[PDB]
Design a protein around this nucleic acid. Structure first.
Lengths: 96, 114, 79, 206, 127, 151, 98
RNA sequence: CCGGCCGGGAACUCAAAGGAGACUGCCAGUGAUAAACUGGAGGAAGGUGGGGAUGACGUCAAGUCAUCAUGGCCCUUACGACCAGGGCUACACACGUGCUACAAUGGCGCAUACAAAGAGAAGCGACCUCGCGAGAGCAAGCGGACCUCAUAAAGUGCGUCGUAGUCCGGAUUGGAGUCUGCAACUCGACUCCAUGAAGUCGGAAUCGCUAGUAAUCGUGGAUCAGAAUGCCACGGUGAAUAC
C-alpha cells in the first residue's frame, strides 16, 4: 500500500528507538514533582517521529493500516490466507 | 422557610427542599445539613427558627442565586466577547463541547425548523 | 482541560515572543503553532494564527491568557 | 464466492501444518514473517525445480526447512553446492543456524502444487487450456487418484469475457472431512492477464 | 455411612454428602435458610426429600460452587437425587418419575456472528 | 406449527401454595426475567385479597378469575375472500390463560400506588365482577354474541 | 523440586514428548509425580473474511496451547545429566526451571 | 494463629488426555409381510438430543483495480516525494442502526449473597499512604489453573420517596481538575461542584424472537499511547405462546 508509506513507517521506527526509550527518560523522570524550570517540557524539539505513538502497526506483508492483528503481525486478509494454507502453526477453524 | 432568597420550600425532607436553591444540588445540601448539624430527613415543618437561620448562615457561604446567575452570565459574556471558538459557538446557538451537529444537536439547537 | 504540569507553547514561539517584546511590537507573527497557550508577556502583540489556509491576525487582550492560540482562528467557514 | 479452503478445514483432521514451531507472543510475528521470507526466497529460487511444499520447524533457536520437491537432483546438484548455498542464505534470512532437507515427491502428477504449476506453465507457454486441463486429469487419474478436479478461470484463450470451465473425474468428496483432498492453486500471468488454476486431488478416504 | 452425589446444573456443581440423622442441611458451612433461603425457591433442594420424607431421616453436608442462585439450587436437587443411592434402586423408580434424575442439560447458547445475542437478529430496514 | 405438533413444558408449582395455576399467574405478571419480584407482588396482593374477602387464598383467586374467563371468542377466517369474525369455543388452558392476561393487563392499567394494590384491587373488583377485566370479558362476549351467525 | 513445564500446540505431540521425559527421568533418576495437565489456553481470532464491506461474514479461528507439568522430585545427578540434550521434540517449549 | 492455614489425603469438584455411550438398539400398534410413523420401557440424553463448522451447479456482466496480485490506458521536475497547519468532527435538513429514558415490577441510602469466559512484559500492576473523586507516590507478585486486571450486577433484607415532570430522566451549559500523548483550540476520555432541556409510552407504518429462546442484568476481549452506547465473546435471572 503505497511504498512511500511503508518507508515512512520504517523512518518512524528508526527514530523511535534512536531518540526515545533513551530521552523519553525526560518525560518519565523530569516531568515530575521534584522542583521548577520550564526547560525539559521545551526539550521536546526531538524530531516528533521519535514519538512511539506515531507508529501505525501496518501489515507486515502488505502494509495495510486497518485490520491489523498484533499476535500475527498481519492484516486480517493475510491472516486468513496464511491460516488456511497452514503456515500459521496451531491455528485452525474454531467452533464451540 | 424563606432561605437564601425568596426561595420558600417546605413539606419535604431537608436534603431535597434545599435543592430548590439555585446552586445547591445533593452534595452541597448534604454539606449544609452536616455543617449546620441537622439530620438529613427532617422537614422544614418540624424544624425550629434558630435552626432555620443556622441553615441561612450555612447557605450564605457558597455562591448561590443572584451571584451565581450573574457569575454564569458573566462567564458566557466573556466568551462571546472574546470571539473564541467557544464564543462564536456559544453565540450562534450550536453545541460547544465538540459534539455532533450533522444530526442530534437538538437541545442546544432547538426543535426542528421546517 | 489538560496538563497538571506546565502549560504549553512551542519553543520557536517562545523565542519569537521574547524577541517580539524586546524590540517592540512591530509586525504580526506568522504562527502555525495553534497548540500554544497564550502567556501574559504576549499581551499587546499581533500574532497571526494559521487556520489551514490563511494567517489571521489575533490581537492579544489581557483575558486571552488562559487559552490556546487556535481558539481565535476559526478553521471552518460556515455561512 | 463461497467454498472453504479444503486444506484449512482439514488442518487437525488429516492434513498437517506447514509450520510446526511453538512460540510465545513475543516472537510469534517475527517467526511468522521470517517464514514468509524463507518461503518467498526459496519459492522464487527453485522455480525450475518443481517444488511442492516447504515445511518450517524451529527446534530451539534453529530452523529445519524441508523442501518437498519432485526433482531432488536439481535442488541438490553436482555435489550439493546448491543445498549449502541455500542454507547459507536461509541462515542469512532467518538469523538462526539453518538446516535444510529434501524430501522427494515421487508421483509428481498427484501433487496439486505441481499440477497447478504445470498447467500454469503450459498456459504461459500459450497452449490451449483444454489440453492442459484434460491431460492433467487423465495422467493424474492414471496413477491412483480416486478423484481429481481442475478449474482454470479468467479470460481463457485471450477473450474479452472471462469464463471458468472446470473438469473433473472420479470422486472428489469435498464436504467429507476425513477425505485426503490435496488442494492447491496457482496463477498464470499471461499477456492477457492472470488466469487462475485451482486443482483438487482426492487420494483416499482417511 | 457417607453417600455421595455429583449433581450439576448450568455451570454449577453441588457435592452432596448424606449421613443418616436429623433433618438439617449444611451448605458451604451455612444453613439452607441463610445460603439462598432468603431468596427464590429453596423448595427445590427439598423436593427430592418429599418423595419419601426427610422428617428426621438424614443429615446432608452439601458444597456447591459455580453458577447463580437457581443454578446452584437445581444442582443440589440433582445432587441429592444422585445421592439417594443410600437406599437402593427402589427410590429411582419414583424419583425417576418426578423427572429428578435427569441432568437438565440446558446451557446458555453461544452468541453468533452478526446477531446481537444468541438468536436476536438486529432489525432490518426498509426491505 | 406449520408441521410440528408440539408437547408442552412443565412449570414448577407455586412455592407457597403448590398451585401451577398461580405459578403461571406469576409468569404472566413477570417482566424482564425478574421472578422474585413478581412472586412478591402476587403473595402480597393475594394475601391482602385473602384478608379482605376473608374466604381463603386461592379460592378467592379462583372466584375472581372465574368471573373473567371467556366463554367463546371471535377469530378471523379469510376463507371466501371476506373478513369474518367467527365465534369459536375457547380451550380451557387458553381460557384461564386469557383470564390471567386480562387481569394482569387491567391491573397494569389501574392508578393505585403499588402493584400489589393495583392487582389486589383488580381481583377484588373481579370478585363482584365489576372491574376492567370483566369489561374485557363482556366485550369479547358481545363480539361473539353479535356475530353468532357464523358456525 | 525440578518442575518441567511443557507447552505445545498439538496434544498428541505434547503427550508423546512428556511420556518420553517421564520414562527418561524415572528410568534414570527417581520420584516423578506425573504429567499433570494444567488448562488449555484457547485464543480466539475473529477476522473479516472479505476484502471489502460485508461485516457479517467472519471467520473464527483459535490456537490451543496445551501445558503439561511433571515436577520431578529427586535431584539425582544422573537424571539431570540424562535429562539434558534429550528432547527430540520440534513444536514443544520446555521450561526446566528448578 | 479457624483462613485449605499446615501436616496430610487422594475419595470429590475440577483440570486434560484416553475410552464407554444413542444406533429406531428393545417392546407394542399401524403400514406393500417394505420404507417408515405413533406410543412405551431402559437411560444423562430418543429419535438429524442442543449449538457450531461445513454453503451443490449456477444467478445477480452483484462487491472489491483502495489489502494484495494484474492486462491495457494514463502522470513520470508530476496524478511521484518530504513537511507544518487544516479537514475527514462542517449543519436549514432527511433516512438507517443503536444507547438512555419517560419510572413505584421504580429512584436513592445502608448491609449482604451467588458467576463464566478472558487478557497481561514499552504489559497487568497488589498492599500501604495521600486525594471527595478521576487519580498520584512508594511499589510486591506475575510471562502466569500461583500474581494482577477484579468488587459481578440484576438479587435479597431494611429505611425513605409517594404519583409529583417529582428524590424520574439525564441532555445542555458554566467552573474546577486527572490521565495519556511533542501536543486535547478546531478535535479526547474520565472525575468533582453547579445547571437540570426534551420526554408521562410514541401517527401512518415496521422489526426480532419457538427454550436457557425472547426479555433483562452485568463481565471480558480485539484494534489501541489515549479514545466504544459499536463489534466479538462470556455467564446471572428467566418468560409468554403456537388452534
Amino acid at each position: 500500500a503505497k511504498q512511500s508509506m511503508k518507508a515512512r513507517e520504517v523512518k518512524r521506527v528508526a527514530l523511535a528507538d534512536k531518540y526515545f526509550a533513551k530521552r523519553a527518560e525526560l518525560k518519565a523522570i523530569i516531568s515530575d514533582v521534584n522542583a521548577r524550570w520550564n526547560a525539559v517540557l521545551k526539550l521536546q524539539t526531538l524530531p516528533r517521529d521519535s514519538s512511539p505513538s506515531r507508529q501505525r502497526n501496518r501489515c507486515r506483508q502488505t502494509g495495510r493500516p486497518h485490520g491489523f492483528l498484533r499476535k500475527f503481525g498481519l492484516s486480517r486478509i493475510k491472516v486468513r490466507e496464511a491460516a488456511m494454507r497452514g503456515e500459521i502453526p496451531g491455528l485452525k477453524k474454531a467452533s464451540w | 422557610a424563606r432561605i437564601a432568597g425568596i426561595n420558600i420550600p417546605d413539606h419535604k425532607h431537608a436534603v431535597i427542599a434545599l435543592t430548590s436553591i439555585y446552586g445547591v444540588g445533593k452534595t452541597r445540601s448534604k454539606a449544609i445539613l452536616a455543617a449546620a448539624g441537622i439530620a438529613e430527613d427532617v422537614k422544614i415543618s418540624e424544624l425550629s427558627e434558630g435552626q432555620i437561620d443556622t441553615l441561612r448562615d450555612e447557605v450564605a457561604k457558597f455562591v448561590v442565586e443572584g451571584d451565581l446567575r450573574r457569575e454564569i452570565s458573566m462567564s458566557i459574556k466573556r466568551l462571546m466577547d472574546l470571539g473564541c471558538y467557544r464564543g462564536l459557538r456559544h453565540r450562534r446557538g450550536l453545541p460547544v463541547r465538540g459534539q455532533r451537529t450533522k444530526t442530534n444537536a437538538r437541545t442546544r439547537k432547538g426543535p426542528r425548523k421546517p | 482541560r489538560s496538563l497538571k504540569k506546565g502549560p504549553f507553547i512551542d519553543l520557536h514561539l517562545l523565542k519569537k515572543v521574547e524577541k517580539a517584546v524586546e524590540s517592540g511590537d512591530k509586525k504580526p507573527l506568522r504562527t502555525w503553532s495553534r497548540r500554544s497557550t497564550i502567556f501574559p508577556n504576549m499581551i499587546g502583540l499581533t500574532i497571526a494564527v494559521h487556520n489551514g489556509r490563511q494567517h489571521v491576525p489575533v490581537f492579544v487582550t489581557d483575558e486571552m491568557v488562559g487559552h490556546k492560540l487556535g481558539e481565535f482562528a476559526p478553521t471552518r467557514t460556515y455561512r | 464466492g463461497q467454498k472453504v479452503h479444503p486444506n484449512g478445514i482439514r488442518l487437525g483432521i488429516v492434513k498437517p501444518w506447514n509450520s510446526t514451531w511453538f512460540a510465545n507472543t513475543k516472537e510469534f510475528a517475527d517467526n511468522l514473517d521470517s517464514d514468509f521470507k524463507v518461503r518467498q526466497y526459496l519459492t522464487k529460487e527453485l522455480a525450475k525445480a518443481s517444488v511442492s511444499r516447504i515445511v518450517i520447524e524451529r527446534p530451539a533457536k534453529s530452523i529445519r526447512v524441508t523442501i518437498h520437491t519432485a526433482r531432488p537432483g536439481i535442488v541438490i546438484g553436482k555435489k550439493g553446492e546448491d543445498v549449502e548455498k541455500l542454507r547459507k542464505v536461509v541462515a542469512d534470512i532467518a538469523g538462526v543456524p539453518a538446516q535444510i532437507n529434501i524430501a522427494e515427491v515421487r508421483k509428481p502428477e498427484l501433487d496439486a502444487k505441481l499440477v497447478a504449476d504445470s498447467i500454469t506453465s503450459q498456459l504461459e507457454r500459450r497452449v490451449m487450456f483444454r489440453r492442459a486441463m484434460k491431460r492433467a486429469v487423465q495422467n493424474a487419474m492414471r496413477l491412483g487418484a480416486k478423484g481429481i478436479k481442475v478449474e482454470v478461470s479468467g479470460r481463457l484463450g485471450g477473450a474479452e469475457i472471462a469464463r471458468t470451465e472446470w473438469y473433473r473425474e472420479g470422486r472428489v468428496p469435498l464436504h467429507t472431512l476425513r477425505a485426503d483432498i490435496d488442494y492447491n492453486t496457482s496463477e498464470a500471468h499471461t499477456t492477457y492477464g492472470v488466469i487462475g488454476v485451482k486443482v483438487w486431488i482426492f487420494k483416499g478416504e482417511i | 455411612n457417607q453417600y455421595y452425589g455429583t449433581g450439576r446444573r448450568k455451570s454449577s456443581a453441588a457435592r452432596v454428602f448424606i449421613k443418616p440423622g436429623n433433618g438439617k442441611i449444611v451448605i458451604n458451612q451455612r444453613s439452607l435458610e441463610q445460603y439462598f433461603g432468603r431468596e427464590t425457591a429453596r423448595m427445590v433442594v427439598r423436593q427430592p426429600l418429599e418423595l419419601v420424607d426427610m422428617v428426621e431421616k438424614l443429615d446432608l453436608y452439601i458444597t456447591v460452587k459455580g453458577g447463580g442462585i437457581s443454578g446452584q439450587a437445581g444442582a443440589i436437587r440433582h445432587g441429592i437425587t444422585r445421592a439417594l443411592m443410600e437406599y437402593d434402586e427402589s427410590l429411582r423408580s419414583e424419583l425417576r418419575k418426578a423427572g429428578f434424575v435427569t441432568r437438565d442439560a440446558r446451557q446458555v447458547e453461544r452468541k453468533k456472528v452478526g446477531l446481537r445475542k444468541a438468536r436476536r437478529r438486529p432489525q432490518f430496514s426498509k426491505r | 406449527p406449520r408441521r410440528r405438533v408440539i408437547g408442552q413444558r412443565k412449570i414448577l408449582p407455586d412455592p407457597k401454595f403448590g398451585s401451577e395455576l398461580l405459578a403461571k399467574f406469576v409468569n404472566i405478571l413477570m417482566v424482564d426475567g425478574k421472578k422474585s419480584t413478581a412472586e412478591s407482588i402476587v403473595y402480597s396482593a393475594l394475601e391482602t385479597l385473602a384478608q379482605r374477602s376473608g374466604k381463603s387464598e386461592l379460592e378467592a383467586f379462583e372466584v375472581a378469575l372465574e368471573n373473567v374467563r371467556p366463554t367463546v371468542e371471535v377469530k378471523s377466517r379469510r376463507v371466501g375472500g371476506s373478513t369474518y369474525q367467527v365465534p369459536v369455543e375457547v380451550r380451557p388452558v387458553r381460557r384461564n390463560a386469557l383470564a390471567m392476561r386480562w387481569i394482569v393487563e387491567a391491573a397494569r392499567k389501574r392508578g393505585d400506588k403499588s402493584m400489589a394494590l393495583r392487582l389486589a384491587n383488580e381481583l377484588s373488583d373481579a370478585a363482584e365482577n365489576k372491574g376492567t377485566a370483566v369489561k374485557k370479558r363482556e366485550d369479547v362476549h358481545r363480539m361473539a354474541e353479535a356475530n353468532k351467525a357464523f358456525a | 523440586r525440578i518442575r518441567i513445564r511443557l507447552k505445545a500446540f498439538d496434544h498428541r505431540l505434547i503427550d508423546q514428548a512428556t511420556a518420553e521425559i517421564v520414562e527418561t527421568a524415572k528410568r534414570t533418576g527417581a520420584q516423578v509425580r506425573g504429567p499433570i495437565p494444567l488448562p488449555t489456553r484457547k485464543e480466539r481470532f475473529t477476522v473479516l473474511i472479505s476484502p471489502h464491506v460485508n461485516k457479517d461474514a467472519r471467520d473464527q479461528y483459535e490456537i490451543r496451547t496445551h501445558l503439561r507439568l511433571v515436577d520431578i522430585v529427586e535431584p539425582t545427578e544422573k537424571t539431570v545429566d540424562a535429562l539434558m540434550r534429550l528432547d527430540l521434540a520440534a513444536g514443544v517449549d520446555v521450561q526446566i526451571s528448578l
